[PDB]
Amino acid sequence: VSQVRQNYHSDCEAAVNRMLNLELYASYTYSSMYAFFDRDDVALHNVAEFFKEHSHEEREHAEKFMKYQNKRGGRVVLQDIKKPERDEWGNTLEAMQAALQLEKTVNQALLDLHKLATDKVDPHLCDFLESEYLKEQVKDIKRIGDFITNLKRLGLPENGMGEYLFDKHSVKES
Amino acid sequence: VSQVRQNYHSDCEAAVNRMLNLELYASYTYSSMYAFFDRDDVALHNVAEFFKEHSHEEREHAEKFMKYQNKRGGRVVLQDIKKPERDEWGNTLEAMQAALQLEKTVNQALLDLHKLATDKVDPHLCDFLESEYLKEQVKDIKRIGDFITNLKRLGLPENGMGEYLFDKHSVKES
Amino acid sequence: VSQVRQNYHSDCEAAVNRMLNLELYASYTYSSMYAFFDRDDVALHNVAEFFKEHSHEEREHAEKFMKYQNKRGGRVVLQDIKKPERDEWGNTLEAMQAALQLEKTVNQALLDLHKLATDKVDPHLCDFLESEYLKEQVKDIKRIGDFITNLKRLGLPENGMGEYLFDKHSVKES
Amino acid sequence: VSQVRQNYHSDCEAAVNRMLNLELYASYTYSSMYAFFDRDDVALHNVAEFFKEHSHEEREHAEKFMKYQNKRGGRVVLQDIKKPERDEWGNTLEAMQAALQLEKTVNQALLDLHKLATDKVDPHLCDFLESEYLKEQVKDIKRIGDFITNLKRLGLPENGMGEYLFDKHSVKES
Numbered sequence: 196v197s198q199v200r201q202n203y204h205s206d207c208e209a210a211v212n213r214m215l216n217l218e219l220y221a222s223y224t225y226s227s228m229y230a231f232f233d234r235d236d237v238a239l240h241n242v243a244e245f246f247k248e249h250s251h252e253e254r255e256h257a258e259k260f261m262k263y264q265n266k267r268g269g270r271v272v273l274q275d276i277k278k279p280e281r282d283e284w285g286n287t288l289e290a291m292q293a294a295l296q297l298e299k300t301v302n303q304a305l306l307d308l309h310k311l312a313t314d315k316v317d318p319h320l321c322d323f324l325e326s327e328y329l330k331e332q333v334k335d336i337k338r339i340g341d342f343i344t345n346l347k348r349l350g351l352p353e354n355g356m357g358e359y360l361f362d363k364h365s366v367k368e369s
Numbered sequence: 370v371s372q373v374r375q376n377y378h379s380d381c382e383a384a385v386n387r388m389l390n391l392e393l394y395a396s397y398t399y400s401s402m403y404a405f406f407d408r409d410d411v412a413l414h415n416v417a418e419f420f421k422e423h424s425h426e427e428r429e430h431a432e433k434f435m436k437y438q439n440k441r442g443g444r445v446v447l448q449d450i451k452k453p454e455r456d457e458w459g460n461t462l463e464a465m466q467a468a469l470q471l472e473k474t475v476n477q478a479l480l481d482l483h484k485l486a487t488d489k490v491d492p493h494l495c496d497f498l499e500s501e502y503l504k505e506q507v508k509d510i511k512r513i514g515d516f517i518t519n520l521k522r523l524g525l526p527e528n529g530m531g532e533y534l535f536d537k538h539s540v541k542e543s
Numbered sequence: 544v545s546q547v548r549q550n551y552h553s554d555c556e557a558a559v560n561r562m563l564n565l566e567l568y569a570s571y572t573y574s575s576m577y578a579f580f581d582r583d584d585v586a587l588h589n590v591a592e593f594f595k596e597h598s599h600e601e602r603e604h605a606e607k608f609m610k611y612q613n614k615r616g617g618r619v620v621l622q623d624i625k626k627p628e629r630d631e632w633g634n635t636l637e638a639m640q641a642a643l644q645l646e647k648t649v650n651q652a653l654l655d656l657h658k659l660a661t662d663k664v665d666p667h668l669c670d671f672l673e674s675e676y677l678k679e680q681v682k683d684i685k686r687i688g689d690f691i692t693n694l695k696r697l698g699l700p701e702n703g704m705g706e707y708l709f710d711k712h713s714v715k716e717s
Numbered sequence: 718v719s720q721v722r723q724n725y726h727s728d729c730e731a732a733v734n735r736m737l738n739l740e741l742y743a744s745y746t747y748s749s750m751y752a753f754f755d756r757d758d759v760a761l762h763n764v765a766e767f768f769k770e771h772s773h774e775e776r777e778h779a780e781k782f783m784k785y786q787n788k789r790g791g792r793v794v795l796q797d798i799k800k801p802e803r804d805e806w807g808n809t810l811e812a813m814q815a816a817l818q819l820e821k822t823v824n825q826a827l828l829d830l831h832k833l834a835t836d837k838v839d840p841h842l843c844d845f846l847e848s849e850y851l852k853e854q855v856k857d858i859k860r861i862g863d864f865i866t867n868l869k870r871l872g873l874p875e876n877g878m879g880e881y882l883f884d885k886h887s888v889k890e891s
């Protein structure tokens with residue numbers, strides 16, 4: 196047993212390793228979306244950069260879990276990072292719909308980990324999730340929902356001009 | 370009778386309290402519009418902020434009436450602030466049409482109060498309305514009319530792309 | 544169902560709308576106190592400004608709830624904002640006693656909402672209340688209790704000189 | 718007839734000369750109050766300076782009327798400036814009560830001149846009174862009423878300590 200370990204359940208330790216993997220999985224999916232929108236036959240560079248940034252965010256959140264694991268005296272155990280579900284992402288609407296879904300999947304895993312931490316009476320883990328993850332999750336979900344509403348408004352997937360305008364106005368220029 | 374009171378008719382005092390209520394009512398309606406355009410299924414954030422600003426303006430104008438009442442030695446009497454007429458505002462065109470109408474309602478109440486002040490030979494109240502309210506009222510009515518003309522030009526309510534472009538170009542970015 | 548909605552109970556959504564109304568109610572009561580202390584026959588201007596500031600604070604907290612509702616995919620539903628319980632507030636001691644009571648009422652509604660969020664296993668709503676509301680609530684209650692103790696010490700309600708001195712020394716000069 | 722004169726009734730011209738005299742009369746009364754509170758057996762120097770400032774304000778308002786008379790092509794006609802009604806002013810409460818009364822007298826003369834200007838269809842004179850005189854009049858009346866309320870609260874005329882504190886806290890230190 197680690198000399199630092201206190202009030203840290205084995206189940207929580209394991210679930211933290213699974214969360215770490217899920218963040219790396221999410222980061223990798225966003226990297227795929229970045230590469231797709233960088234294609235010469237897609238060429239929506241502000242959209243591409245948006246997904247690149249989110250890939251870097253999820254990677255940082257994985258790192259955060261590693262650091263957390265060690266602070267509590269748990270042990271980081273890594274698994275394969277599965278490739279994304281798709282090799283190509285259709286268009287900005289399809290990608291944002293996938294992103295929404297991915298953020299909700301990540302959010303459900305966070306909420307599940309909070310339930311577990313609650314069951315094991317671990318308020319440090321509960322606070323950590325609340326402060327570092329749950330708030331920013333809800334904000335990302337809201338942002339992407341807002342985007343999907345605007346892409347629909349702009350006539351996606353049929354309206355190319357709408358897709359062009361989204362890339363100029365809705366995501367920051369890169 | 371207040372020690373400061375001079376040339377201040379009871380009828381004017383009462384009409385000032387009713388104006389105060391109407392400004393609070395207007396502020397509350399604009400707050401509703403703000404919340405509507407902030408919805409994830411509406412998501413026109415520059416439009417939302419425009420209405421938020423106007424809500425704050427009307428609230429400040431209510432405060433102004435309170436201060437005025439006390440300066441003249443009248444007594445502030447508050448009533449319920451009625452909820453807005455609608456819970457949802459359709460789209461940017463419908464909301465701006467409602468806003469036009471609300472500003473004209475407020476303007477008519479100001480003009481009615483000016484008539485009353487004129488009938489009661491109260492030049493201080495007349496000047497106050499002229500300087501602090503009537504000018505800025507006409508400017509807000511003109512601005513919103515200009516907006517409605519542009520929203521029609523942009524193909525509202527059917528043309529989503531037009532609605533998207535209005536939010537980017539016609540109202541200041543937030 | 545909103546595309547962003549996740550782990551957000553209908554009961555919580557409704558209780559958030561009721562909290563929003565209660566914050567607007569509180570803001571309106573403080574506005575009344577502001578107008579009272581601005582009267583020429585009361586004329587305690589630093590006290591008046593204290594209540595004005597608290598009115599603006601509660602309004603900002605209402606806005607916050609609106610934004611929260613939308614972030615979670617709930618829907619803002621507004622009701623009438625009831626006028627304050629009194630038209631006149633007696634003196635600084637009576638007003639601060641009313642304010643104490645109002646802050647405790649608001650605090651109980653926050654605590655009740657935290658219980659509900661806890662029952663519905665909503666840690667995002669729990670954290671939100673904890674971070675944005677509960678701490679600052681306890682501080683406002685303490686401040687007002689401190690004031691009431693000093694007003695009693697100063698001989699309120701009989702001792703006018705004490706009331707004058709409170710306005711100069713206990714609340715910031717405006 | 719002056720080459721500049723247009724739409725300027727003889728009655729208005731004369732009433733402007735009487736207003737000029739009344740402003741000089743007011744200025745002189747405030748000068749008396751200044752000298753009273755500067756006495757070694759009164760010695761309330763911040764109160765004294767308050768009245769000195771108001772004496773200078775009323776003098777500037779007299780000058781303003783002179784300039785106005787000439788701008789319209791009327792002719793300045795001066796009369797004796799009557800000495801103040803009292804040689805000694807009792808205490809801060811009595812003086813502020815006299816000041817309230819003097820400001821209301823000046824305000825009634827302004828309102829009477831506005832009625833006359835209205836009867837003679839002189840909108841330039843009406844605007845002049847509205848912009849340069851009537852607003853600031855209401856503010857001075859409110860300020861002095863506020864003071865009288867605080868002096869009563871402080872136990873004037875019996876409570877010397879209250880009178881001392883008013884001079885330190887309610888009027889700006891000189």
Ligand SMILES: [Cl-]
Pocket residue numbers: 196197270
């Ligand atoms: Cl180990």
Ligand SMILES: [Cl-]
Pocket residue numbers: 200201202203
């Ligand atoms: Cl342990």
Ligand SMILES: [Cl-]
Pocket residue numbers: 202
């Ligand atoms: Cl423990």
Ligand SMILES: [Cl-]
Pocket residue numbers: 200201202203204
């Ligand atoms: Cl342990």
Ligand SMILES: [Cl-]
Pocket residue numbers: 203204205206
């Ligand atoms: Cl264990």
Ligand SMILES: [Cl-]
Pocket residue numbers: 280281282283
């Ligand atoms: Cl694929």
Ligand SMILES: [Cl-]
Pocket residue numbers: 296297298300
């Ligand atoms: Cl997913």
Ligand SMILES: [Cl-]
Pocket residue numbers: 325326327328329330331332
């Ligand atoms: Cl967070």
Ligand SMILES: [Cl-]
Pocket residue numbers: 341342345365412414
């Ligand atoms: Cl958006």
Ligand SMILES: [Cl-]
Pocket residue numbers: 349350351353354
């Ligand atoms: Cl289309």
Ligand SMILES: [Cl-]
Pocket residue numbers: 341342345364365
């Ligand atoms: Cl957008």
Ligand SMILES: [Cl-]
Pocket residue numbers: 370371444
């Ligand atoms: Cl009264």
Ligand SMILES: [Cl-]
Pocket residue numbers: 374375376377
């Ligand atoms: Cl009168």
Ligand SMILES: [Cl-]
Pocket residue numbers: 376828829
């Ligand atoms: Cl009159």
Ligand SMILES: [Cl-]
Pocket residue numbers: 374375376377378
């Ligand atoms: Cl009156």
Ligand SMILES: [Cl-]
Pocket residue numbers: 377378379380
């Ligand atoms: Cl009356």
